[PDB]
Design an enzyme around this catalytic site. Structure first.
Site, PDB file in Angstrom:
ATOM      1  N   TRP A 290     -13.882   6.224  15.345  1.00 28.45           N
ATOM      2  CA  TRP A 290     -13.399   6.864  14.109  1.00 28.45           C
ATOM      3  C   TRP A 290     -12.188   6.162  13.494  1.00 28.45           C
ATOM      4  O   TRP A 290     -12.014   6.134  12.266  1.00 28.45           O
ATOM      5  N   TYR A 495     -16.944  22.435  10.616  1.00 30.43           N
ATOM      6  CA  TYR A 495     -16.145  21.240  10.927  1.00 30.43           C
ATOM      7  C   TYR A 495     -14.631  21.554  10.970  1.00 30.43           C
ATOM      8  O   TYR A 495     -14.088  22.143  10.018  1.00 30.43           O
ATOM      9  CB  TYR A 495     -16.423  20.143   9.911  1.00 30.43           C
ATOM     10  CG  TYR A 495     -15.997  18.790  10.354  1.00 30.43           C
ATOM     11  CD1 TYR A 495     -16.462  18.277  11.559  1.00 30.43           C
ATOM     12  CD2 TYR A 495     -15.174  17.993   9.563  1.00 30.43           C
ATOM     13  CE1 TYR A 495     -16.107  17.031  11.991  1.00 30.43           C
ATOM     14  CE2 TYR A 495     -14.802  16.712   9.993  1.00 30.43           C
ATOM     15  CZ  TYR A 495     -15.274  16.259  11.216  1.00 30.43           C
ATOM     16  OH  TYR A 495     -14.947  15.027  11.699  1.00 30.43           O
TER      17      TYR A 495
END
Ligand SMILES: [Ca+2]
EC number: 1.1.3.9
Length: 639
Positions: A290, A495
């Site tokens: 990420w 999320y």
């Protein structure tokens, strides 16, 4: 931004009452529909009476209230921003009960919300306990009260949601501070965003279950914006927070001193990685493309004793990569990691292929077979959850997730993985008939009785969007290999949502969003009370009590003796959790084998294997015949 969960109640008939109000700033200025007029309590002329200040609304008629909003004064003046607060509801105006929402709002002029489970009420009271900057006054430009389109009484036996804890930040990451019992939460460099961070700073917030106080702290000492990190509780009782927005940083949270200490930089820049505490108290991490670049990010290991990260280049990430459409950016994220015997770490997914990671020498990885069942090979399950609900028996329940991180349909797939020795391919079977509801970005915790509570998520993974939300949580009961729907909640948790088990045996579920100007930021959490805390009447059950413990610190293989106020049938140790991005590699549960000494005195031994009884802080729960758990006694497990 944020949003109410319900729809604004018409305020035409409302009568409002304020503890005090300056002329020019009457109580009714908060309900006039004008963002430029505000109620304000006494100042100057009338003196400056300090809070609490109280805004009480008679809606004249019963409404199915599921929130309020509070728009602060919009004149560029901060005076009277509500900080600490409570929301009460009432049918009579006299009996107010307990707050349906409480906590602290961030110190700014943005609209604040209290979103909570629908409750028929005619009266709504907002208590301002403090002003956000500690001043005497309370001001509200607009106050609104929201309604669901209906009310259904919760079903008896299926737990209860509430209250809401209002927060100054989106708690996208969280941990229990085991020595204090408090809930530690953090966002990023901002209360509501991670995007655009210059690095070096993390906003944090704490909730104290005993006092109900929500506080906040900006952490810069560790030069770390801790959004999207690895999190592990090490054997030195410190929470090791790795990388993320500042991809090489390590921050250490010490519960005892309630403070953050700089840790060593990791060898590899990572974000979205999982880290896992090992049997020796060290912390392993792997993957995380990420941030810090997209390339093979193999394992590395943190020693709390030498205060170093050491690369384990032969602990190869390649075997645990999913087939994510986005490639290595996502494919090495959020490994379902569990510390296990002899410095090993089991990687249960999300990739179909499961793997053993070894931490001796320069590391190793061995295939542990594919997560599968007679229903077939389990597909990649990015943001599926994995929970070790019986560490003694190596039992891991995995569930949900989607083949790709985003823009991918979640599934109801669920498996029971049974760990044996490192290097053997564990048995895996399907869990019951799978989840009731396909979900990704859901969260989960193991409960004192070994059941796993599963909450939130959406059917189709769309980060920052509250679409296809799942409102009905589920509990897997291992003894029955059955999932049970519980009473639903009303706040989307997708999320960037978290769940943690509280010492009182309740579940703290919160967050979601962290998208700046988006409306899908949730600056809150709610408590879920499992059915095991309720008697047959639907009232709170009498809880058995641990009246004495031989010690608060035990070595693996060590004995603890307790006395109780009543006979107990079952007992468990639950390792304190940490949570972010669906990941919680800290929680696990040990079912205890009790020796009845007579006289309501019992003893048990902590498992001798520190791969099972991972060093760190644990909760001891004892359950009476009725199956009601005590509140937790904190036990430190050492080597
Ligand atoms: Ca107004």
């Amino acid at each position: 931004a944020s949003a109410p969960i319900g729809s604004a109640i018409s305020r035409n008939n409302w009568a409002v009452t304020c503890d005090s109000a300056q002329s020019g700033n009457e109580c009714n200025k908060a309900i006039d529909g004008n963002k430029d007029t505000f109620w304000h309590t006494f100042y100057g002329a009338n003196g400056d009476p300090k809070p609490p200040h109280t805004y009480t609304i008679d809606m004249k008629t019963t409404q199915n209230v599921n929130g309020l909003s509070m728009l602060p004064r919009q004149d560029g003046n901060q005076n009277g921003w509500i900080g600490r607060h409570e929301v009460y509801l009432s049918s009579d105006g006299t009996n107010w009960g307990s707050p349906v929402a409480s906590g602290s709002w961030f110190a700014d002029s943005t609209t604040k919300y209290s979103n909570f489970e629908t409750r028929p009420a005619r009266y709504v009271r907002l208590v301002a306990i403090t002003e956000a900057n500690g001043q005497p006054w309370t001001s509200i430009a607009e106050i609104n009260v929201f309604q669901a389109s209906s009310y259904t009484a919760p079903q008896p036996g299926l737990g209860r949601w509430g209250p809401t804890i209002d927060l100054p930040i989106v708690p996208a990451a969280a941990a229990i501070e085991p020595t204090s019992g408090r809930v530690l939460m953090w966002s990023s460099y901002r209360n509501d965003a991670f995007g655009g961070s210059p690095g070096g700073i993390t906003l944090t917030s704490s909730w104290d279950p005993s006092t109900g106080i929500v506080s906040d702290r900006t952490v810069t000492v560790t030069k770390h914006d801790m959004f999207c990190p690895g999190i592990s509780m090490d054997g030195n009782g410190q929470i090791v927070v790795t990388g993320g927005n500042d991809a090489k940083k390590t921050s250490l949270y010490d519960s005892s001193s309630d403070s953050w200490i700089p840790g060593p930089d990791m060898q590899v820049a990572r974000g979205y990685q999982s880290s896992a505490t090992m049997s020796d108290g060290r912390v392993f991490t792997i993957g995380g493309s990420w941030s810090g670049g997209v390339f093979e990010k193999n394992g590395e290991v943190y020693s709390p004793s030498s205060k170093t990260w050491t690369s384990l280049p032969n602990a190869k990430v390649n075997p645990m990569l999913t087939a994510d459409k986005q490639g290595l950016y996502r494919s090495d994220n959020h490994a379902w990691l569990f510390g296990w015997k002899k410095g090993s770490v089991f990687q249960a997914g999300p990739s179909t292929a499961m793997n053993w990671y070894y931490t001796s020498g320069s590391g190793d990885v061995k295939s542990a077979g594919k997560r599968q069942s007679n229903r077939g090979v389990a597909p990649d399950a990015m943001c599926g959850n994995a929970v070790m609900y019986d560490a003694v028996k190596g039992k891991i329940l995995t569930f949900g997730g989607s083949p790709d991180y985003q823009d991918s349909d979640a599934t109801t797939n669920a498996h029971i993985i049974t760990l044996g020795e490192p290097g053997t391919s564990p048995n895996t079977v399907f869990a019951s008939n799978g989840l009731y509801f396909a979900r990704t970005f859901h969260t989960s915790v193991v409960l004192p009785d070994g059941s796993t509570f599963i909450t939130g998520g959406q059917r189709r993974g769309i980060p920052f969007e509250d679409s296809t939300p799942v409102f009905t949580p589920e509990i897997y009961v291992p003894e029955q290999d059955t999932f049970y729907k519980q009473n639903p909640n009303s706040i989307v948790r997708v999320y960037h949502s978290i769940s943690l088990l509280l010492p009182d045996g309740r579940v703290f579920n919160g967050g979601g969003g962290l998208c700046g100007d988006c409306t899908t930021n949730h600056f809150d959490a709610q408590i879920f009370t499992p059915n095991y805390l309720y008697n047959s009447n639907g009232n709170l059950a009498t809880r058995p009590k641990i009246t004495r413990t031989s010690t608060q610190s035990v070595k693996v293989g060590g004995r603890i003796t307790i006395s109780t106020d009543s006979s107990i049938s079952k007992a468990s140790l639950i390792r304190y959790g940490t949570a972010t991005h669906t990941v919680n590699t800290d929680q696990r549960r040990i079912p205890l084998t009790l020796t009845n000494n007579g006289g309501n005195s019992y003893s048990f031994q902590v498992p001798s294997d520190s791969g099972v009884a991972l060093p760190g802080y644990w909760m001891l729960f004892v359950m009476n015949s009725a199956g009601v758990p005590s509140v937790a006694s904190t036990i430190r497990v050492t080597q």
